Amino acid sequence: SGVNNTKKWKMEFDTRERWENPLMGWASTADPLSNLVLTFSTKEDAVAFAEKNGWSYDVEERKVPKPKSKSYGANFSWNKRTRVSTK
């Protein structure tokens, strides 16, 4: 439930081939950027960094949880369906 890892913007790169190492079965890669992840305060900072380095990019808009209407009292409604059958 913690939300502390949804604070900052991230920039990552497209996943490329990983294959099994013949000797051991380890995951081999030839992609130098496979582990590169950058952190940005705002979407504008990330886009500006991508532009100056020449990377094409996709930006996904931030998803914020909808504000909900919570009410303990609704659990015991006289005539509504929100009445709970168990606690």
């Binding site: 409604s77 006289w78 005539n79 509504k80 369906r81 929100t82 009445r83 059958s85």
Partner: protein
């Protein structure tokens, strides 16, 4: 004659297994019509 020496609550010595529910059944003709929430149950 005022007698403060005898226990007068001896009827319950003769109560049985359905006394309470038999009385509840007897009282059913005296009750006001129940109110309604407007649906059969919260699951309707």
């Amino acid at each position: 004659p005022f007698d403060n020496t005898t226990y007068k609550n001896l009827q319950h010595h003769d109560y049985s297994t359905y006394t309470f529910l038999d009385l509840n059944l007897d009282l059913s003709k005296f009750r006001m019509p129940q109110p309604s929430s407007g649906r059969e149950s919260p699951r309707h």
